[PDB]
With several copies, the nearest count.
Chain A
Amino acid sequence: IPVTEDGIEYRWGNNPPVRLWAQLTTEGKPHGWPHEIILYYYGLYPAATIVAV
């Protein structure tokens, strides 16, 4: 299933509903050399960053 930053619900059998939504994660070091700022800003919000570069 795809999980976004808004929320996902469960109903599997008769179990009570379960609520999940994701972190911000993304890899790289956002406080280091120039070469990884781009990828950190890329993975987090995948779109609208190609426009920036």
Chain B
Amino acid sequence: APAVTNLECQVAVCTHSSDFGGIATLTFKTDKPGKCAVHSHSNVATIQE
């Protein structure tokens, strides 16, 4: 499951500073459904999942 192809990201709301306020959406062409890792190298933000 290489499932990147081309990747783009939209951001809806980032009401921040308390627990988790950034709700982001990801769309991309993909292969078969399956599990894939995700993180952020930059420490300016963090990913709960």
Q: Which residues of A contact B (CB under 8 A)?
A: 23-24
B contact residues, total (Cβ < 8 Å): 3
For A24, give the chain B residue with the smallest CB separation: B17
Q: Which residues of B contact A (CB under 8 A)?
A: 16-18
CB distance from A3 to the nearest CB of B (A): 15
CB distance from A29 to the nearest CB of B (A): 14
CB distance from B14 to the nearest CB of A (A): 11
Q: Which residues of B contact A24 (CB under 8 A)?
A: 16-17
CB distance from A11 to the nearest CB of B (A): 25
For B17, give the chain A residue with the smallest CB separation: A24
For B18, give the chain A residue with the smallest CB separation: A23
CB-defined A-B contacts under 8 Å, sample of 4? A23-B17, A23-B18, A24-B16, A24-B17
Q: Which residues of A contact B18 (CB under 8 A)?
A: 23
CB distance from A41 to the nearest CB of B (A): 15
